[PDB]
Amino acid sequence: AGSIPGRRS
Amino acid sequence: AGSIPGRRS
Amino acid sequence: GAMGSMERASLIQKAKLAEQAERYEDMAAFMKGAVEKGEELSCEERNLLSVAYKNVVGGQRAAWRVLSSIEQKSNEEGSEEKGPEVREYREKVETELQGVCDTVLGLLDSHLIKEAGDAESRVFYLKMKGDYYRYLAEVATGDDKKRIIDSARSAYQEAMDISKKEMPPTNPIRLGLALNFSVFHYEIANSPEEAISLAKTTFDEAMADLHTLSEDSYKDSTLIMQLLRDNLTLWT
Amino acid sequence: GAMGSMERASLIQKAKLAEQAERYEDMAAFMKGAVEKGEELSCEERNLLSVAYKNVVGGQRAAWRVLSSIEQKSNEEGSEEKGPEVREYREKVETELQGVCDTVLGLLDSHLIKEAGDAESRVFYLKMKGDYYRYLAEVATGDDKKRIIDSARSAYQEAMDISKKEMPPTNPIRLGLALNFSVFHYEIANSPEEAISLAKTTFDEAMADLHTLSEDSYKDSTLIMQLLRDNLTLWT
Lengths: 9, 9, 236, 236
Ligand SMILES: [Cl-]
Ligand SMILES: [Cl-]
Hints:
The complex is a heterotetramer, with two copies of chain A and two copies of chain C. In chain A, 0% of the residues lie in helices and 0% in strands. Chain A has no helix or strand. Chain C contains nine helices and no strands. Chain C is globular. Chains in contact: A-C, B-D, C-D. At the C-D interface, helix 1, helix 3 and helix 4 of C face helix 1, helix 3 and helix 4 of D. The PDB classes it as peptide binding protein.
């Protein structure tokens, strides 16, 4: 189950 | 040009 | 902070360089220094702060899961005592993860959230607060795990209330908040029905608002809508 | 060292756990602590030491190349002065890389190499010495770049002399040494003909010795032979 990846701006 | 990767034992 | 002698603009510039070099611990330290200058953060600067710490804690969470899995195998029937090393090392990573989460929560509390008045900034910071309490909850076991879960829920809930009042249903911040709150419900709060209902209602209300968007905004919103759909596919 | 209070066996166990968790900075610190116990290292322990620091310096080299590329673009005709930030940050990463290389070289010098009598251990450490001087040479520009290159060449050369006397041409340590020495010739020493000749002679002499090997040894040797072939394909 994925949260916002948000590791690249 | 590649050296020995050697990043996994 | 070691960053007190560096210009705010230089800290931001170096955070961007660290992202390009995939040096996320540096990036987080630069953005921490920028926050401690005391000025509010722009939309771009908020993203830099979030990307930096998400990568740092992301590596710690991944390592904690590897070590926790090894530790649980070692404590099974027919297992061979390997010594305290696996537990000790899992504890070390866990303590380091909790320190990073506490640092982020400290920045939000001193004083990003109280100075955030616009919906875009306030929802962003409150979503962050819920996220980093959620990461604390993932490793919590003691007297305070219930209080940590409630702290995550309370931050997410305030953020949700603001976003429903102040943002359209396709707003990417609103969509990503609902996505992560739904993951909180499923993975942390043992409320999979709440998770599925939130993801479904969020997706459907965004779908009905897509006709208002430009081509670029449409791409931004449908990307996150797909993440909601991916979770619903996994959960049902 | 912070590892002085931990058992040698526990340091080794934690280094293996750190590798599984992809925590290579931890792994390097654990293996540094193990070396400083003063006992010689086993074949497996030498590999752990090498894997740990190769990953640490590998991330630093990758970041240094990203930053060096940005810095060189900023110093072109028609470029806009961005301030000292890119140079300052490249220097920071460069200094951190040099510190890691110095730490490894210090471990080899105090006292891994002088206590290494068997060909397998001595060639391994001398190859490491050549490698980490090579990494120093990649970023060197000042009064000592020639001396750094000569230090790399001297370590590689001693290792080559021993391996040709004491190991079969298919020995994986001997093959990997020749591979990296050939990369040294091509990338550092401006001797591409020496690089091609070494890779070709190494490959051909290994090919003629493969008939002596078991299925498992054959797989180990042909894997590195392919790396030699890949370089020859790129260089010719
Ligand atoms: Cl530990
Ligand atoms: Cl810097």
